[PDB]
Amino acid sequence: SMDYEFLKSWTVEDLQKRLLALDPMMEQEIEEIRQKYQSKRQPILDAIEAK
Amino acid sequence: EFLKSWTVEDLQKRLLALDPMMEQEIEEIRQKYQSKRQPILDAIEAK
């Protein structure tokens, strides 16, 4: 995380903008985790299917 | 470590074991971003 002592001199508009930029970044990471687990499930589901 | 010889019960159990693992990773991402946000919120609040 960034230094509060630096951030404290920014405008509210600029601070908000940084917060808003973090939202799609966090969502993207969560979506990638969902895709990672979809790949992990696949060989297990294939093994189940094969009976 | 091939799976085709496992019982359905054991295969389902392995699928289920993935659920808390994924949740844990998602939670680690939420915590990372909570830490990032905090000084920015504090700076907004201190104006």
Side-chain angles (χ1 to χ4, degrees), chain A residues 8-49:
Chain A
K8 138 190 196 199
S9 67
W10 293 28
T11 59
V12 175
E13 189 170 322
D14 277 319
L15 293 164
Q16 291 180 331
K17 190 151 161 189
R18 175 50 65 100
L19 281 177
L20 286 167
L22 294 172
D23 290 337
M25 294 176 59
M26 183 177 90
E27 292 303 305
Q28 173 180 54
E29 292 180 38
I30 292 171
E31 290 304 324
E32 288 287 354
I33 286 299
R34 296 190 148 111
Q35 285 174 35
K36 167 187 162 182
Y37 280 82
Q38 190 229 83
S39 303
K40 289 190 112 144
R41 288 198 297 279
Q42 201 55 54
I44 303 164
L45 295 164
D46 292 348
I48 289 169
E49 232 164 303

Side-chain angles (χ1 to χ4, degrees), chain A residues 1-2 4 7-8 10 12 15 18-19 22 25-26 29 33 36-37 41 43-45 47-48 51, chain B residues 3 6 8 11 14-15 18 21-22 25 29 32-33 35 37 39-44 46-47:
Chain A
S1 78
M2 294 180 69
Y4 170 82
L7 291 168
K8 138 190 196 199
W10 293 28
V12 175
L15 293 164
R18 175 50 65 100
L19 281 177
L22 294 172
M25 294 176 59
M26 183 177 90
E29 292 180 38
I33 286 299
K36 167 187 162 182
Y37 280 82
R41 288 198 297 279
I44 303 164
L45 295 164
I48 289 169
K51 60 209 86 179
Chain B
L3 292 165
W6 291 27
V8 176
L11 292 164
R14 184 152 174 97
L15 280 176
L18 294 173
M21 292 175 62
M22 182 175 89
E25 293 201 79
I29 292 159
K32 165 188 161 182
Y33 280 90
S35 301
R37 290 197 301 279
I40 300 164
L41 297 164
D42 293 347
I44 289 168
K47 299 294 187 168

